[PDB]
């Protein structure tokens, strides 16, 4: 395969993740205002789903941060992985997590897919269209949970609502049924 292509694409992914992180942060800051407004107009479940979007976006941001960390680690040890044919223990987690997340963020970032392809075409032990699906069972659990697709816990959403109402100087009556459990 081409190694310089991988290196360049890693740098590009890093930069794109930085920009996207900043942008997502700004958008969240701008949407929290809308959430507060919806809270200040009777609508409660609506603002609930909105803050659900927000927490999902923030999980995405955290996952992108971790992914950027792993990409920078790979860019650092590039010289090491470019020579050896079999990956080491230090790069195993990074490679697995990145290859597992590539199809997840393939829409937001495209270079990540190319990175995953280069890594797949580079390795052969448990690597491929099907071998990777079984060899990606050692990816980061934290990122796996953050990037997962599941309805967050209602208690967390209620706490987010409470806080967003406190900061924006507006009232909010959290459901005791959720605050109890």
């Amino acid at each position: 395969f081409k190694a310089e292509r991988l290196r360049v694409n890693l740098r590009l992914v890093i930069n794109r993740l930085k920009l996207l992180e900043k942008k997502k942060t700004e958008l969240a800051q701008k949407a929290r205002k809308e959430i507060a407004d919806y809270l200040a107009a009777g609508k409660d479940e609506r603002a609930r789903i909105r803050v659900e979007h927000i927490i999902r976006e923030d999980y995405l941001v955290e996952a992108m941060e971790i992914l950027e960390l792993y990409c920078d680690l790979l860019l650092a040890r590039f010289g090491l992985i470019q020579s050896m044919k079999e990956l080491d223990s230090g790069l195993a987690e990074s490679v697995s997590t990145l290859i597992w997340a590539a199809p997840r963020l393939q829409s937001e970032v495209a270079e990540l897919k190319i990175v995953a392809d280069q890594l797949c075409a580079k390795y052969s032990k448990e690597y491929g269209k099907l071998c990777r699906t079984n060899q990606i069972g050692t990816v980061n659990d934290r990122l796996m949970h953050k990037l997962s697709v599941e309805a967050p816990p209602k208690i967390l959403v209620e706490r987010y609502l409470i806080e967003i109402a406190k900061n924006y100087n507006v009232p909010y009556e959290p459901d005791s049924v959720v605050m109890a459990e």
């Binding site: 310089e4 292509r5 360049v8 694409n9 740098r11 590009l12 270079e111």
Partner: protein, 50 residues
Amino acid sequence: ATLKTMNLEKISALMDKFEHQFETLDVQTQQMEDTMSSTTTLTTPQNQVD
């Protein structure tokens, strides 16, 4: 069309080439500095300028 033609990878490669080219140009300038300082040395002593 432009991005498909002038992609990010092509940009990075081109910029690295630019950088290396001008580093080589610096080397050339240093080479010429050394030579020109060696040649015109009798007409430009060090003790006098000091």
